[PDB]
Structures are given as C-alpha cells and as structure tokens.
Design a protein around this ligand. Structure first.
Ligand SMILES: Nc1nc2c(ncn2[C@@H]2O[C@H](COP(=O)(O)OP(=O)(O)OP(=O)(O)O)[C@@H](O)[C@H]2O)c(=O)[nH]1
Ligand SMILES: Nc1nc2c(ncn2[C@@H]2O[C@H](COP(=O)(O)OP(=O)(O)OP(=O)(O)O)[C@@H](O)[C@H]2O)c(=O)[nH]1
Ligand SMILES: Nc1nc2c(ncn2[C@@H]2O[C@H](COP(=O)(O)OP(=O)(O)OP(=O)(O)O)[C@@H](O)[C@H]2O)c(=O)[nH]1
Ligand SMILES: Nc1nc2c(ncn2[C@@H]2O[C@H](COP(=O)(O)OP(=O)(O)OP(=O)(O)O)[C@@H](O)[C@H]2O)c(=O)[nH]1
Ligand SMILES: [Mg+2]
Ligand SMILES: [Mg+2]
Ligand SMILES: [Mg+2]
Ligand SMILES: [Mg+2]
Lengths: 429, 435, 131, 429, 435
C-alpha cells in the first residue's frame, strides 16, 4: 500500500540510484540475487512500498533507469547488484545529450520519452494504491536535466493528483563541472517550480566539506560521496515503511514544509556523522543529535543559514528514544536560536519518530529545512546566466535544435520573480 | 554500439595513423595479425569484428603518391588493414593546392567516398569522423578540403574533428606553406566542428627538454601526438566516474561558430629515470599541464585570455582532489579568463590508466591529463601566417603554378579577406565590450 | 538544373521550431500543428511543384496517407523529383517515416535553405492545385 | 466424439501442419513412433477428436497432407516425426502450380482434387460423428491457394451441414514474397467469402515483429513462426479437446463471433509471450495476461485495432484460475476501452475457460478478435489488384489456361462490395 | 523424380557446358569415371542411373565443327558422357546464319531430334529444356533457331530456358555479329519462354575489379556462368525453406509476351585474400548484388526502371534479415520501379551452401545470392544493335554471302521491322502513362 515509483535519469541519477538500492536492500534484508534472507518479520510487513513481489518469492524493485547513452547501463548490469533489476526497465539511447537542453528535451528526448512513459504506465496499473514518484537527477547535465524535466511534464499530465519529489544535484559556486552550466540550470528550474511538489537541493562541495572535516576522509571518491546522499533520501521514506510512535509520510511533510506553492526548495541534513576512529568517545544520545544537525557545518547544501531565516523545519528521527527528550530540545533550540526563525510562523518545527534504527547505529535523524538562504543560490545562478546571455555565448547550439531567444527571456523573468518573493517574505513583518 | 571512423590523408596523416593504430591494438590487446589471446563491448567502437576471431580496423588510408602507403602494406601491420581500404593514386599533388583539389584529386574522390559509405552503412550508431591531415602539403590540404565538402553533403549533422599540423613559425619544410595554409582554412572553415591544432616546432622542444632526448626523429613525435588522440576518445572505449562523449567536446569549446581552434596539451611527459624521483600527484600534473612551456603549439597563453578549457584525467584519480586542484589553478594570477565566461572548466575522469608502447620514451604512469584550451592567444598564429601570405602575394610569386592548374587570381583575394574577417572576429570578442 | 546548398553549422540563420511550422502552414494554407506530422511527405512533394513547375506528377501522390506502407510511396515520388532536377541530397527515408522529432526537424532545416535558393517569387493558389 | 478432419495445402500448410502435429503430440503424450507413453488418463479420455486408433494400440493422425510438388512430402517423410503419418494420405503431383491460379484450380486441380476427395470421403465414413474441417494454407502461393479453394468448394458441396475453419497466411504490406500476389489473393478471398465458415487471417511481418520485439530473438526463423501459429491453433481446439469449468466448441465460437454471413475474418493472439531471460521477473497472473493480450503490439495480424472498433471478441483461457478474476478484468477492460467497442452490440465479449494448462506454463490464453481493421487490408489488396489489372499485366498467363477477364471483374466487384459493407457497419450508430 | 534436359549448341555452348557439368559432378559427389565413393533423390534430376553404379548425364552436345567435340571426347570427362550423345558434323557454319540454318544445319537436325526424343522418352516427369548458345556464332544462332522450331513443334508447352551471350558494345570477335544477332532474335522471339542474357565485357570487368585477376581467360567466365546456372537449378536439385521452380521463374519474370529478356547477377564474387577481412552478411550481399556495377550485362539499370526481380539466396539464410534487407533496398534511392508493379520481388531460399570447384578463383562462402532482374535498360542494347545492323545493311555488305546460301533480302527487311516493333513495344510499356 502507498507504494512509490522510482525514476532515475542521467549518469548522476544512475550512480546515486545504484547506491540507493544498496541501502534499501540492506534495510529489508534482501539478498543481491533478489530473495529474502532477513530475520525479523517487521521488514516484510511493508515490502510492496518499494519492492515488487514476483514468482518464487523473488522481489524486483520498482525502478526505471534511463539514460541517453549506453555507458551507464553497462556498469550497473554487468557489475554486482545488477542481477535483481528488471531488464525491461533498462531503457537507454545511443548518443548522449551533449550537455544541451535541446538535445535532451526536444531532439533526442522525444525519441525515448514515449518508450519510458509506457513502462511508467505499466507500473501504475500493477500498483494497488499509488503514493507518488521519486526522481534523482542533475541540474547541470543534458539528459539528467533536459529529459528528466520532460518526464516531469508528461507524468504530471497523466497523474495530476500525486506527489512527487526530485532529489536534484544543484550546481556549484566555486568550480563548475561543465562550462555551460547556467544555460542548463536556469532553463531547468523554470520547469521545476511549476510541476514539482517538493525538491531537495544538494550541492557537491558541501558534501566534500562534510566528508573532509566531519568524517575525517582525505580522499573521498564518488562511492563515499553518494553513500551520504542515499541515507538522507532513505531517511525521508522510512517513516511509512516501518511502524513508529509518531508516524509521518511523504504527503505529511509537504503540508508542513511548503507554506507557498513556489517555495518548495529544501536543504537536507543527516546526523550523526562520525569517523571510524572517533566513535568510541561519544555517547550516542538525543542531546548531541539535535545539536549536531542544526549547525551550518553539517548541512548538505553550500548555503550558510546564518544569512537567512528558517521558514519551517522538519526533523525525522529514527531508532528508539523518549518523546520527552525529543520535544524538550526542539523548544530549547527554538528559544536560544530564536533570531533565525520567521516571526509570522509560530512553533515552526515538525517532528516525527520511527522505531527501526539504521544499520550499525542506535539512533539517527534527518533534517529538512525550508530556509530563506536558498535565495542566494538562485541569485548567483541568475548572475552567471545574465552575463553569458548578453554576449550571446554558447547560444548558437541551443537555437540550432529547436528553441529561440524568446524561450530564454521567459526563463530568466520567472527566475528573477522567484528570488524577489523568496526574499520579500524574509523581510516581511 | 558506438562507431567512429578515421580518415588519414597525405603522408602526415598516414605516418601519424601508422603510429596511432599501433596504440589502439596495444590498448585492446589485439595482436598485429588480428587474433587476441572494462572488457566484457570495448573494441567494437574501432575494430569491426569479422566472421572469425579476426578484427579489422575502421580506417580509410588515402594518398595520391604510392610511396608511403606501400610501406604500410609491407610493414609489420600488413595483415591488419583491409586491403581495399588502402587507396592510392598515381602521382602526388607536389605541394600544390590546386592539383590536389581540382585536377588530380577529382579523379579519385569518387572512389574514396565509395569506401566511406560502405563502412558507414555497415555500422549502426555512427557519431563522427576523425580526420588526420596536415596543412602545408598538397594532398593533405587540397584533397582534405574536397573530402569535407563531399562528406558534409552526404551526412548532414555529424561530428567532424580535425587533428591538423600547423606550419611552424621558424622551422619550415616547404616554401609555399603560406599559399596552401591560407587557402585551406578559408575552405574548411565552414565544415569543421572542432579542429585540434598541433605544431611540429613546439613538440621538438617538449621532447628535448622534458623527455631529454636529443635525437627526436619523426617516429618519436608521432608517438607523443598519438597519446593525445587516444585520450580524446578514451571515454567511449572505457568506463569512468564521469564520462564524456564526442558531442560534449564540441558543445563545450566553441562559443562562436568561427572560433573553433583549440590547442592540445599532454601531461605528464617524463623520461624513465626522472620518473622515480617524482611522486606524480594529481595536484601537480594539473599545474604541470598549465605551464606555458608545455603547450603543444608555439604560442604563449600568457599573451591572451582563455575562453574555455577541458581536462581529461585517467587512472587512480579521485574527484575530490581534482576539484581542489582546479580551484587553486583558477585563483592563480597567471591564468586569466574572459569576463563573459564565469564558468570555464569541463572535467572528465576515466578508470583506465594509460598504456605504454614498447620501446617508447614515456614511462609508465598511473595518472594522465589531456587539456584542450580554446584561447585567444592563437590569434597571433593567424596574424603571422597572414603576414607571410600578404608579403609574397603582393608581387604575385609562385602564382603561375596555381592559376594554370584550374584556379583563378580572383579566388586568392576571397580567401585573403576571409582570414582578415576571422582575425578581427577573434580579437573583437576576446577583447572586452562596454556595458 | 537546380542549385544546391549544404548545411553543417550556421549562426543567426537557423530558425526557431515555432517559426518553421508557421512558414509551412502559410505557404500551403493548411493546419499542420506538429512539425513531426511532416512524415507524410505530401507537403514536401508540393514544395517541389512550387519551386519548379512540372517535374512532379502531383496525381501520383495522395494526401490521405495514414499507414507505414502509405508513407513510403509518397517519398518515392519525391525521390524521382530530386533526380530529375539533378539535386544530390540523399533522403534518409528509413528514418523520416518513423515520425520522430530528430530526423524530421533536420530535413526541413535543410529544405528551408533549398527553398530560398531556388525561389523566384512566383505565387499561386495551392487549393486548386491540391483539388 | 466430435472428430475433426485436418487438411494441409502447399508448402506453408505442410510446414505449419508439421509443427502443429508436433505440438498436439506433445499435448496428448504421444510418442513420435505413435504409441501412448504419457501418464494422466485425461489425455486418453478424448483422443479420437484428432487422432485415430489402430491395431496394436497405435494412433495415427486424421490428417491429409497434399501438395503438387513432391519436395515437401519428401522432407516430411525423411525428417523426424514422419513415421506416424499414414502414407495413403501422402498425396502429391509432379509439377508445382507456378504461383498461378489457373494451374492451381483447373489444370492440376482436377486430378489432385479427385484423389483427395476420395481420401476425404474414406476418412469421413470412418469417422463416427463429424464435427468439422480444418484447412491451413496461404493466399499468395499458387498450389496452396488454388487447390485449397477447390478442396473447400468440393467439400462444402459434399457436406453442407458442417463447419470448417481456414487458417490462411495473408500477404504482408511491406515486402511481397511473390510478385503476382494480388491476383491470387483476390480470387482466393472471393472464393473463401463465398463458401467458408470462419477464417483466422495470419500475417508474416506482424509475426516477425512480435518475435523480434516481445520475445527478444535475434534470428527469428520459420520454425519459431510456425511454433507461434501452432500454439494458437492448439489453444483454439483445446476447449473441446479437454474438460473445463466453462466449455466451448467450434460452433460456439462461430455463433458468438459471426454476426453476419460475410463477416468472418478474425485476428488471433496468444499470451503470455516472454523471452527466456525475463520470465523470472514477471508474476504469471490474470491481470497481466489480459493486459498483454489486449494490446495491438501483441497481435498476429498486421492491422492496428486502434484504427477501428472491435465488433466482437472471444477469449479462451487455459489452466486453473478464478472466474471472479476473469470476468472482473474483462469488465474492467471493456469499461476502460469503451470507445473502441461497437455501440449497438452490448456485452460484446465471450469468455471460455479450460482446465489443462499448456506444457511448461501455469496458465495461458488465446484471444480471437472480429474487428473492423481488416477493412484496411482488403482495401490495400484491392488497390494493388486494381492497378495491375488496369494496366493488364501478367494476365495473359491466367487467360492462357482457362479463365477470362469476367472472373477478375466479378472478383474485384465482390471485394469492393465486402469492404464497403464492412466500413458501413463500422460507421453505424 | 523431376528431369530437365540441356542442349549445348556451338563451341561457346560446349565449353560452358563442360564447365557446368564439372560443377554438377563436384556438387553431387560423382567421380569423373561415373562412380561415387538434402543428399540421399537429387542426382536423379540430372544424372540417369544405369544398371551398375555409373551415372550418365542428360546432356546433348551438338556441333558442326568436330574440333571442340573431339577435345571434349579426349578430355578428362571421357567416360562420363554417353558416346552417342556427342553429335558432331563435318564442316562449320563459318559465322553464316544462312549456312547454319538452311544449307548445312538441315542435314543433322533429324539425328539431333532423334537423340532428344530418346532422352525425353527415357524420363517420365520431364520439366524443361536448357539451351546453352551464343548469338554471334553462325552455327550457334542457326541451330538454336532450328532447334527452337523443332522442339516447339514436337513438345507443345514446356519450359525452354536459354542462356545466351549478347555481343559486347565495344569488344568484338566477329564482323557479321549484327546480322546474326538480329536474325536470331527475330526468329526465336516467339519460341522462348525466358532467355537469360550474359555479356563477355561485363564479366571481364567483374573479374578484373572484384576478383582482381589480370589474366582472365575464358575458363573464369565459364566458371562464373556455370555458378549462376547451378544457383538457378539448386531449388529443384535440393530442399529448402522456400522452394521455387522453372515455371515459377518463368511466370514471375515474364509480364508480357515479348518482354522476356532478363539479366543475371551473382554475389558475392570475392577472392580468397579479401574473404577474411569481410563479414558477408545477408544485407550487404543483397546490396552488392543490387549494386549497378556488379550487373553482368554492360548496361546501367540506373538509366531505366525495374519491372520484376527474383532473388535466390542459398546457404545459412534467415528469412527475417532477408526480408529486412529487401525492405531497406526498396526504400533505397537508386531502385525505382514501374508504376503498375506495386509488388516487385520474388524471394527463394535454399538450405544448400554453394560448393567451390578445386583450383577455382572464387573463395568458399556460406551465403550466396543470384539476382534475375527484368528491367528496361536492355532497350539501349537493343537500340545499339539495331543501329549497327542498319549501318552495315545500308549498303548491302555480306548480303551476297547470305543470299547465296539460300536466303532473300525480304527476310532481312522482316527481321528489321520486327526488331523495330519490339523496341517500340519495350519503350512504350516501360514509360509511364496517365490514367
Ligand atoms: N552526487 C554525484 N554527482 C555526480 C556524480 N557523477 C557526476 N555527478 C554530477 O552530475 C553531472 C553529470 O552530468 P549528467 O547530468 O549525468 O549528464 P550525462 O548523464 O553525462 O549526459 P550528458 O549531459 O548528455 O553528458 C556532473 O556535472 C556532476 O556534477 C556522482 O557520482 N555523484
Ligand atoms: N607531425 C608530423 N608531421 C609530418 C610528418 N611527415 C610530414 N609531416 C608534415 O607534412 C608536411 C609535408 O607535406 P605533406 O602534408 O606530407 O604533403 P604530402 O603528404 O607529402 O603530399 P604532397 O603535398 O603532394 O607532397 C611537412 O611540412 C610536415 O610538417 C610526420 O611524420 N609527423
Ligand atoms: N507462416 C509461414 N509461411 C510461409 C512459410 N513458408 C512460406 N510461407 C508463405 O507461403 C507462401 C508459399 O507459397 P506456397 O503456397 O507454399 O506455394 P508453393 O508450395 O511454393 O507451390 P507453388 O504455389 O506452385 O509455387 C509464401 O508466399 C510465403 O509467404 C513458413 O514456413 N511459415
Ligand atoms: N562466354 C563465352 N563465350 C564464348 C566462348 N567461346 C566462344 N564464345 C563466343 O562465341 C562467339 C564465336 O562464335 P561461336 O558461337 O563460337 O561459333 P562457332 O562455335 O565457332 O561456330 P561457327 O559459328 O560456325 O564459327 C564469340 O563471339 C564469343 O563471344 C567461351 O568460352 N565463353
Ligand atoms: Mg552522460
Ligand atoms: Mg606527398
Ligand atoms: Mg510449391
Ligand atoms: Mg565454330
């Protein structure tokens, strides 16, 4: 009941998704071959939410992995933990989008969008009671941002009364992976603010910074990087997968987290984060967990909250604890740090508690904050896009495959409108 | 599933291609005969696997004089190439652009296109053509301008990358180099997606200083150039943490349609003995590849401003130090970017350490970098070449050979003004603008 | 005889997707709503008739084609018209008929350039020509 | 009880019949040598419908294979599973019809039809209570088409009060196997429309697409194509061959499917069709069975039902299931796809259920649809024939052996009348 | 169980038959002495089996000059042929159609007919005749016309296929070729079901280019033609997934009574060295056999429109890719059919891979294609021959010889008018018309 459909687009989505189904399988005790090997019967009480029952007690994930180039599917299929995905869902093209909007939303996207949409429609009919969709993609690439938006537009047309989340990977302020980042990002957000209920923005250096100082890792590869994102994205869902003292679900978070339709860009966070060596000198208890997750150092988006004010905040604990300890400290955090919370929203903290701890830990938590400091991220991106567009640089490879000048103009005006209203509420009395 | 074919034109292309295809067989473990003793396929992008275990390359060797092709036929790689692919004429163009484009080339152009279409239709997911041609020669310039016009008509929008050989500033093998180079650039300007520039004079110094070799024959230079070519297409044949394709190169380096002349660079380039005393970290080969003396074209990037770059690592490379090293490079005051390009870096990481050909000068390295900088400093190269062409053409020297072979004096003037249009186009956008 | 033109990479000359559909609709006075609907080739055959009087037997083609086999016959007539006028652009008929945006947009992009090169400004009513 | 006489014509009929008898022997547990080796007695309960008992407990099929050229007979006799047919039934000529209606209907037809009629009469008098006739052939070849028409006419004359099915391989739109297809196709279809009862049109290109796309086969061959066709035929006959919860017969299918005498051209389909690799990731159940059945891509006739309306539909399940599920999902399909169903025929779905699953499968299903998309096939054939006959091509070689232009004119008129009536009944309110 | 007999007339017919019977003996595993060490019957269709294990062919070698027949008699295939079958005259026709049809040829026709009748009555399921003859040769032409008349009189309606040798447009061995060819075409236009047409110049060019032999004597041409004939007859001789017959060929290829002159093509024709570097797929062998330069008659089908095509694949052939390749070929730009033939392909598949003669030029292949195309481009050849005949006859050259050997100029005039009518009919039927 209330199962969700997982869609992975681009190379980042496939690499994040490959580590995501590693954690989910471990939580439910599913062998890589696809058969249940767990012990506690609480795991199989709600297995239909993510996995799908098949013949001979085999379980197949409800995932749809799609990328425009065949490089990514080669690794996941041939590599380990690729014997359990359903081979029908492995949809791929032949030529990459080439870091282009047009070659990922109009020219190459159209060929593949009709094939994936039929796989999506098949899963829903098999589904008993749909809950929503989950999308992991990037805002800098061509297929992850171009076509990933195309699925959002088409799916939102067929299932208007559903809630879907995007675990995007927002670009960087310091070093840009691709030269034409602003053209792809600005055009993407102009489509995301319309057909998405809630979006979790994630950076890469704030993940490098966390994995450098807090985790004590000098050489964090992409395997140790995506492993941090997976826990955050699996922490949100775990409320409905397992019983808890004070339950929550995907729709419950959206009601509390989103005061206004255009203000649905979040900043995740995880705790506890400790190195292997220094875990024996800390007593795992609720006091440090709330303290640890509320500092700007341990946040997964490179945006310091001290420059803004939290509109509303969620905190999805896990493990087992005492409800008094949890509620005692949220009030303490609010009163002491009262200068960073908006005034026209009282008691702006939402708390939920589950009952199943993560693997190898007594208790943990996930912090989701709809802060105002996100305004600075959009201000910077619109700054880079503005300078490039006046000189009309790199643009003769976006007009050549379908768009025009008028499309960019409407994308920047919408982007500038969102920043103005994201700030005029911070200063509103 | 992904196929790209390579066309080698002239002696420079064939001699480079002879060294390059020696490297691919080593990388994929293909014996010279064809049999064999990341890998599951890999070789399918270059080697079309035939009925038996034999693999035959997707190459088209075309030349007008039969002197050098015959060397390849009798060489150690005799059983590899498809005998029909090696196309030969009867007499060379003799450093004459008109002969290799109007009179002699026209009689063999139809046969070459026949073999191209046969190989293209055999493949299914064709991406683009790799062209290895020189600039000073007759068949390497006049004939290669004919192939671009013919190829572009047949296949509308496909990648077409040129690995040219720019004439050197002081070193000069031929004497009519300004006449040939000026004419070629004006004709192939509209039919090239991205042309990589490599100069013979600059490679001599790199081999002399860094590699410390005082006997750098043409065999040694071609091995060093071939490593650049392999790193460009190393992402198609091998997996990696962050892949790039042939199209991604084209979209990230060309801000304007005329400005598509980047210059390559390789790192590290060290000898066998100097290798032990160097720790060879990621944070320094990025620094090494940016030094003004390591650039493969005889021009200092300090005199101009960078427009876009493209790094390509391979081996035991972790993305955290890659992004840390680039951040330090950006804040260095020697490297200066243009105002209208706030983002100026594209990265790509591969998991396949570069291999070494036996008897080669380069040592075994677990890390490598290939840099494709599209910079304004190349505008100096155009100005110098235009100076030579204007000097000799004023008194109409050597023209009587070109005119009498199916050309007009009027055609020279059109190619002269076109290069003048490109020269100030290159400067007027690299310079700042008001507001 | 007819003049030819190539198209590889041009700036400030390629038109938007919306404008290309308007030009096709305006020239023939019809209601194509998607560019990918140009898989039929009925509009393509009419273009050759406008560019060069005759050279195409417009009676052979039919504008009510709705099947995969029906789409091909319309293009075979266009193949002969290209040969007769001596043009040398190979139509990838195996790829247009599938009705996808990629291949259908590139061919009209080339055809727009061919249209301008061989247009003498003559005008007529395609309605009587079509019926 | 209720025995069926099988007739095979031409190379296509012979090969399809060879595969069909392989499948039937596998179903009934009959050794290639002709002796019973299986286990369950439910197979022996009704063995006289197809086979025929003989001394020393042998079983011989009631099949009459006959074709003008001998090569097919030599192949079927020398090959395996040729030791069980009765040699008396092996009838053949000396020279093929040469893809000619005249040589297939008047020249060699006389001798071949005389001998075949004698054999048919002997077999029928041997039979106890005849149920009907089965004829598998092609409408493009000479011998199969012409001599099958002659056999149908003579048998219809001899036994007016009986039913006969014709499994005809209709020509393909893209590529034609023989240059003069339309003349033979038009004449044969005119004769079939005149004097046949029901006809399942089967195409080759649609089978090719089904095998390449769904079954995921790199090199689909005639063995596989004939395997699919034989599976369909066995699924049709299993209802009266085996006991079931809700039995059905050939007469029941005919009366439920045929509303008017000139409308008896069906399109078959079989489910489930899965590749070797992907069978483990699917749950064999009635919902997915019906959803797989009711999509155009899994249709064996190269006609898209989306272009027309289903006049009537029959569905023969196999194996063990639940009638509640069966009729619930039939109702769901009818409600969801109502716009594709004719308005003046309510409840236009017939359902039958057997009890013995096919070999190596828990359950399966055969769907037979009488639709209005065959209108397009008849229209295309009529157009091709009209062009060729207007230009008067190849026609001297049908006049040179007996016929005249009057026959062609009347056949064309009949085809046009039939297609016009089909369309005009499609467009009724 | 099905028997067809072959008549070889003239030196060209005898040599082609020698090559063809060598190929058949190799294919069916029959030793030259007649003994032997799909297949079981097969050889029954050609080789009549006598009391002992010896097999004798159903061939009738007829000639007027005894030299070539004596050569065959003393050749290595001496014990095979029935000695009574080899019929020889005393003096040749000397390139004189009148001598070979009226004066000399009337003195041996009765014996030839008697042998044909005995061989036919020996068999019980007679299918047809295969006549191997040239066109320029006087005895070939005259005796071919006489045999056509006599056989048509004797047996009413049977398949009578011919394998002619059309005179080359430029290469010429005789001087009265136009007279002989025009006369023979007018005489045997009515008594032939289907005539396959082959030219020597095109086979020369094919052997020079594709097979790359610079010394192509008549043996190689004979081997190629024999391969085509065996590919045609393989459907009768062997089982397959989709069989065809002589009546099928005839019906599917002749649309009009006068238009029964198709042309043949074979694929693949590649040497041994080039075989390893080729994959030999069904699609590409179809493309090669349909390529314009591979046609075995010196005429370009691009100049005309196709009317009917018959493809015959033999070997490891899959009908799915066969049908895919045929659809692609139909979609291709070069192939253009006539408006009144919406269906234009007849396909046959055989399960027997082609065999290779020992010492032959061709290489072993697992897939073979024979293409028989009836088209319009033969009209240009007819017009050229008519022009040559008119130019020669305008001033009555060699007409003294022809008239002296029992003919009249009325016959020449009638042949000319008949050829003109045939050309007019061919052009009118090929050209499109409104309504
Ligand atoms: N978190 C995370 N991000 C990644 C990882 N790999 C790449 N990225 C980011 O994702 C972007 C990759 O581009 P994609 O959206 O995947 O584009 P693509 O799949 O290569 O297809 P094209 O856009 O056509 O090249 C890069 O800019 C990186 O910043 C990863 O392993 N983990
Ligand atoms: N890098 C490199 N360049 C070469 C090599 N061989 C020749 N060249 C270049 O080629 C130029 C000589 O003209 P080519 O392009 O070879 O002309 P060609 O191929 O001989 O044909 P013709 O012009 O007709 O003589 C010289 O200026 C060199 O710069 C080589 O081995 N390596
Ligand atoms: N389903 C299926 N169809 C086939 C197969 N083989 C051939 N066909 C079709 O059946 C037709 C065969 O012609 P036939 O009716 O058998 O005629 P024939 O046996 O060759 O005898 P003639 O008509 O005298 O030539 C072809 O047009 C094919 O389209 C097969 O193996 N399976
Ligand atoms: N393809 C092929 N053609 C041949 C061969 N031998 C002879 N010819 C053809 O035969 C023609 C010569 O006339 P023939 O048919 O041989 O006449 P003949 O057998 O010498 O008898 P006469 O006509 O009396 O001289 C030449 O034009 C050749 O084209 C051969 O071995 N192969
Ligand atoms: Mg990618
Ligand atoms: Mg040279
Ligand atoms: Mg037959
Ligand atoms: Mg002679």
């Amino acid at each position: 009941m209330r199962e969700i459909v997982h869609i992975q687009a681009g190379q980042c989505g496939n690499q994040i998704g490959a580590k995501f189904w590693e954690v989910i399988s471990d939580e439910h005790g599913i062998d890589p071959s696809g058969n249940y090997v767990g012990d506690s019967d609480l795991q199989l009480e709600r297995i239909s939410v993510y996995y799908n029952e098949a013949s001979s007690h085999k379980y197949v994930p409800r995932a749809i992995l799609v990328d425009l180039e065949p490089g990514t599917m080669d690794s996941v299929r041939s590599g380990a933990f690729g014997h359990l995905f359903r081979p029908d869902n492995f949809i791929f093209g032949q030529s990459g989008a080439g870091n282009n909007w047009a070659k990922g939303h109009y020219t190459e996207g159209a060929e593949l969008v009709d094939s994936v949409l039929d796989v999506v429609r098949k899963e829903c009919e098999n589904c008993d009671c749909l809950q929503g969709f989950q999308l992991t993609h990037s805002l800098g690439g061509g297929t992850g941002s171009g076509m990933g938006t195309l699925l959002i537009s088409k799916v939102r047309e067929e299932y208007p009364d559903r809630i879907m989340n995007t675990f995007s990977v927002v670009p960087s302020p310091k070093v840009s992976d691709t030269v034409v980042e602003p053209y792809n990002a600005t055009l993407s957000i102009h489509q995301l603010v319309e057909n998405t209920d809630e979006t979790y923005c994630i950076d890469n250096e704030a993940l490098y910074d966390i994995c450098f100082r807090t985790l004590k890792l000098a050489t964090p590869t992409y395997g140790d990087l995506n492993h941090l994102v997976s826990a955050t994205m699996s922490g949100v869902t775990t409320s409905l997968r397992f019983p808890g003292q004070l339950n929550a679900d995907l729709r419950k978070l959206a009601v509390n987290m989103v005061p206004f339709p255009r203000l649905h860009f979040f900043m995740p966070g995880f705790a506890p984060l400790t190195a292997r060596g220094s875990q024996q000198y800390r007593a795992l208890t609720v006091p440090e967990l709330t303290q640890q997750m509320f500092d700007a150092k341990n946040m997964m988006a490179a945006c310091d909250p001290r420059h803004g004010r939290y509109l509303t905040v969620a905190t999805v604990f896990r493990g087992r604890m005492s409800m008094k300890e949890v509620d005692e400290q949220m009030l303490a955090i609010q009163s002491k740090n009262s200068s960073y919370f908006v005034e026209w929203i009282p008691n702006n903290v939402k708390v939920a508690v589950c009952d199943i701890p993560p693997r190898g830990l007594k208790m943990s938590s996930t912090f989701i904050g709809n802060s105002t400091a996100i305004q600075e991220l959009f201000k910077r991106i619109s700054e880079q896009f503005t300078a490039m567009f006046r000189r009309k640089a790199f643009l003769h490879w976006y007009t050549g495959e379908g768009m025009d000048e008028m499309e960019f103009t409407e994308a920047e005006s919408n982007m500038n409108d969102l920043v103005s209203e994201y700030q005029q509420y911070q200063d509103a009395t | 599933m992904r196929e790209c074919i390579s066309i080698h034109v002239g002696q420079a292309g064939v001699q480079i291609g002879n060294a390059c295809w020696e490297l691919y067989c080593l990388e994929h473990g293909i014996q010279p005969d064809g049999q064999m003793p990341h890998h599951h396929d890999s070789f399918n992008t270059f080697f079309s696997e035939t009925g038996a275990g034999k693999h035959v390359p997707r190459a088209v060797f075309v030349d007008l004089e039969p002197t050098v092709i015959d060397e390849v036929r009798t060489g150690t790689y005799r059983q590899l190439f498809h005998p029909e692919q090696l196309i030969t004429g009867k007499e060379d163009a003799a450093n004459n652009y008109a002969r290799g484009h109007y009179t002699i080339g026209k009689e063999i152009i139809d046969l070459v296109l026949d073999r191209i279409r046969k190989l293209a239709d055999q493949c299914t997911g064709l991406q683009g053509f790799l062209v290895f041609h020189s600039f000073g020669g007759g068949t390497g310039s006049g004939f290669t301008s004919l192939l671009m016009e013919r190829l572009s008509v047949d296949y509308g929008k496909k990648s077409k990358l040129e690995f040219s050989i720019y004439p050197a500033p002081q070193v000069s093998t031929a004497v009519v180099e300004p006449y040939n180079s000026i004419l070629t650039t004006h004709t192939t300007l509209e039919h090239s997606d991205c042309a990589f520039m490599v100069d013979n004079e600059a490679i001599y110094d790199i081999c002399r200083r860094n590699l410390d070799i005082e006997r750098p024959t043409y065999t040694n230079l071609n091995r060093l150039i071939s490593q650049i070519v392999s790193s460009i297409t190393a992402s198609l044949r091998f997996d990696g943490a962050l892949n790039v394709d042939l199209t991604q190169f084209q979209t990230n380096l060309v801000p304007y349609p005329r400005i598509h002349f980047p210059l390559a660079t390789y790192a590290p380039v060290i000898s066998a003995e100097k290798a032990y005393h160097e720790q060879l970290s990621v944070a320094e080969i990025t620094n090494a590849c940016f030094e003004p003396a390591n650039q493969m074209v005889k021009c200092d990037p300090r005199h101009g401003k960078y427009m876009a770059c493209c790094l390509l690592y391979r081996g035991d490379v972790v993305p955290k130090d890659v992004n840390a090293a680039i951040a330090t490079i950006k804040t260095k005051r020697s490297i200066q970017f243009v105002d209208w390009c706030p983002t100026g870096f594209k990265v790509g990481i591969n998991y396949q350490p570069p291999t070494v050909v036996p008897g080669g000068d380069l040592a075994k390295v677990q890390r490598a970098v290939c840099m494709l900088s599209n910079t304004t400093a190349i505008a100096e190269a155009w100005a110098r070449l235009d100076h030579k062409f204007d000097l000799m053409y004023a008194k109409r020297a050597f023209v009587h050979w070109y005119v009498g072979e199916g050309m007009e004096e009027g055609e020279f003037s059109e190619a002269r003004e076109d290069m003048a249009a490109l020269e100030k186009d290159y400067e007027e956008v690299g310079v700042d603008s008001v507001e | 005889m007819a003049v030819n033109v190539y198209s590889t990479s041009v700036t400030s000359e390629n038109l938007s997707r919306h404008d290309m559909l308007a030009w096709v609709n305006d020239s023939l006075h019809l209601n194509y709503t998607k560019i990918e609907q140009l898989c039929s080739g009925a509009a393509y055959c009419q273009f050759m008739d406008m560019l060069f009087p005759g050279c195409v037997h417009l009676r052979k083609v039919k504008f009510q084609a709705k099947l995969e086999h029906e789409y091909i016959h319309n293009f075979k007539v266009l193949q002969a018209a290209f040969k007769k006028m001596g043009v040398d652009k190979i139509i990838p008929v195996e790829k247009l008929v599938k009705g996808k945006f990629q291949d259908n947009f590139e061919f009209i992009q080339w055809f727009k350039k061919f249209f301008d090169a061989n247009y003498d400004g003559k005008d007529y009513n395609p309605l009587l020509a079509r019926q």
